[PDB]
Enzyme design. Structure first.
Site, PDB file in Angstrom:
ATOM      1  N   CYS A   1       4.925  -4.338   1.818  1.00  0.00           N
ATOM      2  CA  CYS A   1       5.481  -2.905   1.586  1.00  0.00           C
ATOM      3  C   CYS A   1       6.735  -2.772   2.425  1.00  0.00           C
ATOM      4  O   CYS A   1       7.625  -1.830   2.115  1.00  0.00           O
ATOM      5  CB  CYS A   1       4.493  -2.007   1.724  1.00  0.00           C
ATOM      6  SG  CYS A   1       3.948  -1.428   3.481  1.00  0.00           S
TER       7      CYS A   1
ATOM      8  N   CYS B   1       7.220   0.943   1.995  1.00  0.00           N
ATOM      9  CA  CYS B   1       6.459   1.676   3.270  1.00  0.00           C
ATOM     10  C   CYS B   1       7.478   1.277   4.441  1.00  0.00           C
ATOM     11  O   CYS B   1       8.315   0.344   4.194  1.00  0.00           O
ATOM     12  CB  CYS B   1       5.224   1.372   3.617  1.00  0.00           C
ATOM     13  SG  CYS B   1       5.430  -0.422   4.608  1.00  0.00           S
TER      14      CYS B   1
END
Ligand SMILES: Nc1ncnc2c1ncn2[C@@H]1O[C@H](COP(=O)(O)OP(=O)(O)OC[C@H]2O[C@H](O)[C@H](O)[C@@H]2O)[C@H](O)[C@H]1O
Length: 252
Positions: A75, A157
């Site tokens: 991520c 992320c």
């Protein structure tokens, strides 16, 4: 014929063969995607648009394909990009750590292709396909990319990077896929910073494009999602790639 139904290019020559061959190659290279049945993927993909009106495609039509194409990607290593396709992919071809959407199975299958079917018959239309502007927004290609681009942005992320074309006119364009889908699907709970790399055209000695009005726009937009903003000029994109290819050695 001389008329065509739609204003856009038809399905790419050899589309079915090309999609299948891309899937064998991808699943061969990538150990995580080795469980995938490429004939099953093809059937899921074709199922999304065959015998369907090409102006009435929905994200639901692509659900079977999304399921089969499920992939965990790290991520914190995502590279988004807008209008600077060549350098973004040259970059991830050498820096195998960072990933663009075209480096996932689903992005890799579809990259640079066009496809559509017919409401009339079960055939692929190799003559013309709907143009997003002149014909209709809810066409097989546009709907595919909206769906997969949303899911990719949702996966991100930590620090998310984005390469932008500094020669464009709107360096950040709110109407691009980046500006209209991806920015608005970065998750406030997950994403710490969006960092833009603004790629300079040529010439040499230019403005600091990180002070451009459209970059200030992007900054203030992502601020609402509680996401920090960083921006870097890439004044010399060629030297940049050289540095990516040969890390270390003081020049870089
Ligand atoms: N045909 C496509 N339509 C929409 N989005 C796409 C397409 N192909 C890729 N994408 C997504 O767009 C990203 C690139 O972002 P931008 O450059 O911000 O997208 P944009 O310039 O809006 O591209 C739209 C597309 O439609 C037009 O046919 C144009 O030729 C371009 O291919 C991602 O890598 C991919 O998620």
């Amino acid at each position: 014929r001389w008329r065509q139904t739609w204003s856009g290019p038809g399905t790419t020559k050899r589309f079915p063969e090309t999609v299948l061959a891309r899937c064998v190659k991808y699943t061969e290279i990538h150990p995580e995607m080795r469980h995938v049945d490429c004939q099953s993927v093809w059937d899921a993909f074709k199922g999304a648009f065959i015998s369907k009106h090409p102006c009435d495609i929905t994200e639901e039509d692509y659900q079977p394909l999304m399921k089969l194409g499920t992939q965990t990607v790290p991520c914190n290593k995502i590279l988004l990009w807008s209008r600077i396709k060549d350098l973004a992919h040259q970059f991830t071809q050498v820096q195998r750590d960072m990933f663009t959407l075209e480096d996932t199975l689903l992005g890799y299958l579809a990259d640079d292709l066009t496809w559509c079917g017919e409401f009339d018959t079960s055939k692929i239309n190799y003559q013309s396909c709907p143009d997003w502007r002149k014909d209709c927004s809810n066409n097989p290609v546009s709907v595919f990319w909206k769906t997969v681009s949303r899911r990719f942005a949702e996966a991100a992320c930590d620090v998310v990077h984005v390469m932008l074309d500094g020669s464009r006119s709107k360096i950040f364009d709110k109407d691009s896929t980046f500006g209209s889908v991806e920015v608005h699907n970065l998750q406030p709970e997950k994403v710490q910073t969006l960092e833009a790399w603004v790629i300079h055209g040529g010439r040499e000695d230019s403005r600091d494009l990180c002070q451009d009005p459209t970059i200030k726009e992007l900054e203030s937009i992502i601020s609402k999602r509680n996401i920090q903003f960083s921006c870097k000029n890439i004044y010399r994109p060629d030297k940049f790639l050289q540095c990516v290819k040969n890390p270390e050695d003081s020049s870089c």
